[PDB]
Design a binder for this molecule. Structure first.
Ligand SMILES: COC1=C(OC)C(=O)C(C/C=C(\C)CC/C=C(\C)CC/C=C(\C)CC/C=C(/C)CC/C=C(/C)CC/C=C(\C)CC/C=C(\C)CC/C=C(\C)CC/C=C(/C)CCC=C(C)C)=C(C)C1=O
Ligand SMILES: CCCCCCCCCCCCCCCCCC(=O)OC[C@H](COP(=O)([O-])OCC[N+](C)(C)C)OC(=O)CCCCCCCCCCCCCCCCC
Ligand SMILES: CCCCCCCCCCCCCCCCCC(=O)OC[C@H](COP(=O)([O-])OCC[N+](C)(C)C)OC(=O)CCCCCCCCCCCCCCCCC
Ligand SMILES: CCCCCCCCCCCCCCCCCC(=O)OC[C@H](COP(=O)([O-])OCC[N+](C)(C)C)OC(=O)CCCCCCCCCCCCCCCCC
Ligand SMILES: CCCCCCCCCCCCCCCCCC(=O)OC[C@H](COP(=O)([O-])OCC[N+](C)(C)C)OC(=O)CCCCCCCCCCCCCCCCC
Ligand SMILES: CCCCCCCCCCCCCCCCCC(=O)OC[C@H](COP(=O)(O)OCCN)OC(=O)CCCCCCCCCCCCCCCCC
Ligand SMILES: CCCCCCCCCCCCCCCCCC(=O)OC[C@H](COP(=O)(O)OCCN)OC(=O)CCCCCCCCCCCCCCCCC
Ligand SMILES: CCCCCCCCCCCCCCCCCC(=O)OC[C@H](COP(=O)(O)OCCN)OC(=O)CCCCCCCCCCCCCCCCC
Ligand code: SF4
Ligand code: SF4
Ligand code: SF4
Lengths: 155, 207, 178, 115, 318, 45
């Protein structure tokens, strides 16, 4: 059966992409402070296989952690575009989710989903490092659910 | 009284004496000298005397205020000169703080004090960016906090809280584009003013 | 008072033994070997990492998590449509449209809390006079869309019914401080 | 022939790896993706302008010292000589004049990265 | 049978460097009061395979402002030079026995530097240019120091071969006769491998990624494989040259085991150094080498010229 | 019901070290240079 072989191959590639998630060394604010608290020895993302890389060319997921300013937004869009193709976005905190405390500001993009397509929204101000790790594992499950080879085979 | 602060009339008297001292040293520029009940000395001067007043306070022997703490502006859009430019100065030698006030309008610039304090460079850039108060003889006076193509000075009272434009990614032009602002929520202003006065000490005389 | 961090008091002169000690420090890399020993000791220590989804991090009964609307033990909703939680909400994240109910009680028809706008400050739960709105301990409620974080009254009442076994215990452990 | 085969096998392995890397995944190429990086902003220059390195004298000295290395390298066969006294004297003189050149450059601040 | 020998040299080296990545992550974690990966494998042993599959299933993302020929040539060049450098090592019998083995090692290392330079210049970006220039400075300093060190040590040895190094260290190590040369050679191997303290070519803090800042997945994995293979190789060369394993003609398995143990110890020493120390400035690395190691190694080269003459301990030609 | 509050113990808390504490160890310079020279001479012989 070609369906079974294609499903198992797709599960293999999803396992690889979810076991090796490389976020970018990119944060903006207090939410990025909690992001490096998720990098801290307690909730070891490197134990989870999640390790920061500075360049967007070696990154897999942008963790938008902070307030996306109007002046910042072209930089964030350029940095996201410069990623290679299997790229994900985890919005983190109320600022990146929907503006948060600075929703009615003249200089704040009301949510980073106006700029980049967001895969996972993590609520909080700040969300705890445990909550960000929860969002990371939820992203891992989300890309475990993907069926690219099966959609291609039935295409 | 365990819920009320102490007063320190001694430092109130000291600041009053120093206010007399500065006001008689510089009568050409000083328009008002006041000391608050919080023991803070404010000297309100003419805009032409910003450089001599700040130089005197930077290096006078009895008034060494060599550190500039703050430089800000307050938009009061009911007076003729709608911007009050405020300098908060620190004296490490005498362990004191002074406040110097001047005024401006949208078309009356003030001489920059970068030649006196170097922090005034970025502080006056911020004042120009947020209030539109131009500064004479400022090296590279430009915006510091707004977006690059931003129009208007947002800390003014007549500028809206949400601004006039907002940014979004457009896939047709593949850019981050600016649109007129359209809120899905419309920030609700609250009239949180009691119709009964709270402080009879500040009751203004009737018109 | 004050102290110096890099100033030295007088000098230790020049001596053959002290010169030999400094020469051995430079040539034999003694402080580098000392740093190696320090991180070796850290290698042989026990790591502080917890197994995350099975061992959760410690918390407190004061913890601000996911919002919830509570009920009386009779089952009646505690909220009385008084709107002062949205008056004190520093992010304007609450919308409390209300009308008299069929039995004439003062209740809400729309109670929306924008979790993407909320700053999770607990001002609503400390302002509420009937302990209706609370911030319970749920923090693992991340969603895959922006819309799922725009809560309404049904969602908040469902959270209150879900977490009441924990929220009531936390309020019992906490209410004497507040 | 053996070393040639191993060299060609390693080259073919690297080529096979990069061919797999280029023909395996899915491509989605557009302009903003393939623009140069420059930390999230458009580059001001073209990254081909003159760079003006600061250790040029050290680089030329490295050329001269590399050729002094080439002179010094036949010593393991030189110590097998039948004379060994002129060999020892010549090696001493060579190392001494190399060290004298290094000392003179150090004194004249040649290896100090003039800005 | 020779192709089978090539496979039994190449495949274990690649698995060894992948698990070197695993060992590096775990050792750095346990020195950082955390763990390493322990979820992907039973004890994290599948983590390098997951990383490799993810990197080879991401797109390579050829850029616009980029000399494509050099951009493609450089990582393949780096990997093939790492394996070619692995070729002539004896454990205790090399795959390819070379008379001028050390000279071959030096030439291949310099060509690997050229791979880094061509990648940095081809990826037409400012951070890549910065990384390439830092690589130029670094290789200037360590090249002159390494050449002098190897000259003096192999003057204590006989020819430029490595089985001769085994027979020289049959009775005693070379660490005890020349330990300052061993210290300077260890520092020079760090500089050659571009490892901490003075990495400075993939400087994550001064630059973004150095010469890999435009390399997306694929050829970036090739560069990483070449770097870590070079790490294991420089440690292996250090233990062959200086910490001579026990050699017996009847059985070579204890030689291979001793070589394995000492190479593992020196690789863990590299990870230890990375955990311990901060980064140099790349002018400070040049100043450090050219002002401390180069005069001392010139003097010690002169001392090792004089030593077999006045002790009559000139090594044999063969 | 007496007033119960978060308070220190009646004798106060114990001493807390806060000054810099470095072990101050290692061999002397003469010993290290002597063992290095001895290793050199033994290896040369
Ligand atoms: C107050 O102000 C502020 C700041 O200022 C202080 C900020 O900073 C700031 C920004 C804040 C942030 C961005 C927070 C981010 C967090 C941090 C900066 C701190 C976290 C720590 C670090 C970044 C340092 C990490 C340190 C480490 C030691 C971790 C190790 C990391 C590494 C990259 C090295 C190890 C390597 C890897 C992880 C990958 C290795 C694996 C591979 C490449 C695999 C390759 C292998 C192969 C290809 C093998 C294939 C071959 C085979 C034969 C295999 C066979 C396969 C088969 C399938 C059979 C903000 C916003 C801010 O407000
Ligand atoms: C470590 C050493 C070895 C490294 C290499 C890895 C070896 C093991 C690889 C196993 C998996 C092989 C297939 C990976 C495909 C990855 C890309 C992918 O899923 O593309 C989806 C696409 C789907 O194509 P599509 O028809 O949906 O269209 C693509 C364009 N969109 C989606 C926008 C409409 O391609 C394939 O499915 C190709 C499958 C090739 C299988 C070859 C075997
Ligand atoms: C006789 C056989 C020996 C070879 C000579 C004949 C074939 C080569 C002729 C010269 C081609 C020069 C050329 O096209 O250069 C353009 C290219 C530069 O072009 P480019 O890369 O800037 O642009 C190409 C862009 N695309 C792909 C989008 C069109 O330069 C090279 O190819 C030179 C790279 C080195 C070649 C030799 C490598 C040897 C191994 C090194 C290790
Ligand atoms: C391979 C075998 C193992 C090797 C050692 C591996 C484990 C130890 C690793 C330690 C950490 C290394 C990480 C990188 C460190 C980089 C910094 C560094 O090392 O800088 C070099 C430092 C530099 O120190 P520095 O830079 O601080 O010096 C100050 C100099 N100025 C002021 C000009 C800047 O030390 C050296 O250069 C010393 C090199 C070794 C010297 C050895 C001398 C031996 C004795 C000779 C004979 C003495 C007797 C004389 C004759 C008597 C006759 C009777
Ligand atoms: C069992 C595992 C042991 C691991 C030891 C880790 C390091 C910790 C040691 C303790 C410590 O902190 O000591 C600090 C102490 C120094 O502490 P200190 O800095 O306070 O002492 C200064 C003392 N004066 C001023 C007199 C110099 O180190 C020493 O005493 C000696 C260190 C230098 C000598 C050893 C390193 C250089 C050796 C080079 C030759 C190669 C050796 C063989 C290598 C073989 C393998 C490749
Ligand atoms: C081969 C085709 C099948 C590949 C695996 C598909 C099934 C799968 O992914 O199973 C999940 C299992 C555990 O992975 P996970 O779900 O992340 O566990 C979380 C526990 N804390 O995943 C595993 O146990 C990992 C399986 C890896 C298989 C080998 C990969 C190449 C080497
Ligand atoms: C034949 C000659 C060659 C033999 C082989 C040895 C090769 C040595 C090559 C390098 C020698 C250079 C000496 C001169 C020099 O350039 O010294 C510079 C140095 C100060 O430079 P620097 O350390 O960079 O300081 C920066 C600011 N303080 O100056 C100093 O640090 C001053 C040093 C003074 C003492 C020198 C050593 C005397 C040793 C006597 C031993 C007797 C037994
Ligand atoms: C991506 C492109 C990469 C291009 C660059 C490739 C670099 C390869 C690795 C680095 C090589 C550096 C130079 C090494 C030269 C050989 C060293 C040596 O000593 O060779 C001599 C040796 C036999 O000499 P000896 O040890 O004295 O033995 C006599 C008794 N036993 O052995 C011999 O006599 C064998 C002579 C041949 C050995 C080298 C074979 C190279 C083959 C060509 C490779 C490149 C081809 C072009 C590109 C292909 C497409 C990409
Ligand atoms: S959501 Fe809160 S914690 Fe996060 S960046 Fe905004 S203000 Fe900071
Ligand atoms: S926690 Fe604070 S920001 Fe959130 S709904 Fe309550 S009052 Fe508003
Ligand atoms: S939740 Fe509480 S504070 Fe808010 S409207 Fe209801 S009763 Fe009032």
């Amino acid at each position: 059966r070609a369906e079974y072989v294609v499903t198992k191959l797709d599960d293999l590639i999803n396992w690889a992409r979810r076991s090796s998630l490389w976020p970018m060394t990119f944060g903006l604010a207090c939410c990025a402070v909690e992001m490096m608290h998720m990098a801290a020895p307690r909730y070891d993302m490197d134990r989870f296989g999640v390790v920061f890389r500075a360049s967007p060319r070696q990154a897999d997921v942008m963790i938008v952690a902070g307030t996306l300013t109007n002046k910042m937004a072209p930089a964030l869009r350029k940095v996201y575009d410069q990623m290679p193709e299997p790229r994900y976005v985890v919005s983190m905190g109320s600022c990146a989710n929907g503006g948060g405390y600075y929703h009615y500001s003249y200089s704040v993009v009301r949510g980073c989903d106006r700029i980049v397509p967001v895969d996972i929204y993590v609520p909080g101000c700040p969300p705890t490092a445990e909550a960000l790790l929860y969002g990371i594992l939820q992203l891992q499950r989300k890309i475990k659910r993907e069926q690219k080879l099966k959609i291609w085979y039935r295409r | 009284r365990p819920t009320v602060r102490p007063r320190s009339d001694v430092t109130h008297k000291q600041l009053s004496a120093f206010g007399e001292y500065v006001a008689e040293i510089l009568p050409k520029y000083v328009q008002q000298v006041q000391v608050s009940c919080l023991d803070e000395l404010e000297i309100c001067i003419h805009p032409d005397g910003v450089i001599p007043t700040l130089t005197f306070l930077r290096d006078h022997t009895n008034a060494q205020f060599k550190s500039l703490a703050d430089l800000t502006a307050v938009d009061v859009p009911t007076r003729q000169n709608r911007f009050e430019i405020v300098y908060n100065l620190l004296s490490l030698r005498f362990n004191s703080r002074i406040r110097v006030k001047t005024y401006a309008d949208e078309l009356t610039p003030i001489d920059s004090i970068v030649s006196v304090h170097i922090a005034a460079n970025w502080y006056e850039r911020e004042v120009w960016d947020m209030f539109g108060v131009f500064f004479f003889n400022h090296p590279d006076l430009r915006r510091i906090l707004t977006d690059y193509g931003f129009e208007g000075h947002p800390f003014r009272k007549d500028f809206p809280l949400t601004g006039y434009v907002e940014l979004r990614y457009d896939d047709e032009v593949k850019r981050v584009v600016a649109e007129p602002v359209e809120l899905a929520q419309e920030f609700r202003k609250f009239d949180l003013n009691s119709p009964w006065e709270a402080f009879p000490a500040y009751r203004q005389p009737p018109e | 008072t004050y102290k110096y961090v890099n100033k030295k008091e007088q000098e230790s002169e020049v001596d053959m033994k002290s010169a030999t000690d400094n020469a051995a420090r430079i040539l034999m890399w003694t402080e580098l070997i000392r740093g190696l020993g320090m991180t070796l000791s850290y290698l042989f220590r026990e790591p502080a990492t917890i197994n995350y989804p099975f061992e959760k991090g410690p918390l407190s009964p004061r913890f601000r998590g996911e919002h919830a609307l509570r009920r009386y033990p009779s089952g009646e909703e505690r909220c009385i449509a008084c709107k002062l939680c949205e008056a004190i909400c520093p992010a304007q994240a609450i919308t409390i449209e209300a009308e008299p109910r069929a039995d004439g009680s003062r209740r809400t028809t729309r109670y929306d809390i924008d979790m993407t706008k909320c700053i999770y400050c607990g001002f609503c739960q400390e302002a509420c006079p009937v302990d209706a709105i609370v911030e319970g301990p749920n923090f693992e409620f991340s969603t895959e869309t922006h819309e799922e974080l725009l809560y309404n009254k049904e969602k908040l009442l469902n959270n209150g019914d879900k977490w009441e076994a924990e929220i009531a215990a936390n309020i019992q452990a906490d209410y004497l401080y507040r | 022939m053996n070393l040639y085969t191993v060299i060609f096998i390693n080259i073919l392995l690297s080529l096979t790896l990069i061919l797999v890397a280029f023909w395996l995944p899915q491509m989605n190429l557009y302009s903003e993706k393939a623009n140069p990086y420059e930390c999230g902003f458009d580059p001001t220059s073209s990254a081909r302008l003159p760079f003006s390195m600061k250790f040029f004298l050290v680089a030329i000295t490295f050329l001269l010292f590399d050729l002094e290395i080439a002179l010094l390298l036949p010593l393991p066969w030189a110590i097998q000589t039948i004379k060994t006294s002129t060999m020892m004297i010549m090696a001493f003189i060579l190392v001494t004049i190399l060290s004298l050149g290094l000392a003179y450059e150090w004194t004249q601040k040649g290896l100090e990265w003039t800005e | 049978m020779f192709f089978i020998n090539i496979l039994t040299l190449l495949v274990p080296i690649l698995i060894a460097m992948a698990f070197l990545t695993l060992v590096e992550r775990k050792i750095l974690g346990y020195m950082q009061l955390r763990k390493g990966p322990n979820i992907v494998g039973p004890y994290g042993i599948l983590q390098p395979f997951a990383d490799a599959m993810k990197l080879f299933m991401k797109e390579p993302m050829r850029p616009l402002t980029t000399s494509m020929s050099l951009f493609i040539i450089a990582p393949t060049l780096s990997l093939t030079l790492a394996l070619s450098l692995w070729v002539p090592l004896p454990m205790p019998h090399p795959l390819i026995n070379l008379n001028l083995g050390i000279l071959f090692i030096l030439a291949t290392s310099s060509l690997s530097v050229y791979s880094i330079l061509w990648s940095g210049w081809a990826s037409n970006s400012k951070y890549s240019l910065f990384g390439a220039l830092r690589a130029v400075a670094q290789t200037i300093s360590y090249e002159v120091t390494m050449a002098i060190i190897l000259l003096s040590v192999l003057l204590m040895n006989g020819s430029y071969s490595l089985q001769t190094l085994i027979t020289t260290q049959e009775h005693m190590w070379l660490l005890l006769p020349a330990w300052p040369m061993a210290m300077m050679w260890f520092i020079s191997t760090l500089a050659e491998t571009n490892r901490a303290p003075f990495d400075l070519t993939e400087g994550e803090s001064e630059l973004v990624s150095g010469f890999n800042v435009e390399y997306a997945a694929g050829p970036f994995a090739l560069f990483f494989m070449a770097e870590y293979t070079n790490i294991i190789l420089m440690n292996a060369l250090t233990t062959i040259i200086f910490l001579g394993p026990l050699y017996y003609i009847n059985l070579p398995e204890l030689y291979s085991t001793n070589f394995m143990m000492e190479a593992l110890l020196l690789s863990s020493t590299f990870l230890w150094i990375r955990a311990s120390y901060p980064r140099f400035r790349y002018d400070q690395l040049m100043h450090l080498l050219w002002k401390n190691f180069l005069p001392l190694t010139l003097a010690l080269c002169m001392w090792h010229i004089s030593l077999p003459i006045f002790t009559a301990g000139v090594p044999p030609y063969m | 019901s007496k007033v119960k509050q978060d308070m220190p113990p009646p004798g106060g808390y114990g001493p807390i070290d806060y000054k810099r504490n470095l072990p101050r160890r290692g061999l002397s310079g003469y010993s290290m240079f002597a063992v290095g020279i001895g290793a050199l001479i033994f290896g040369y012989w």
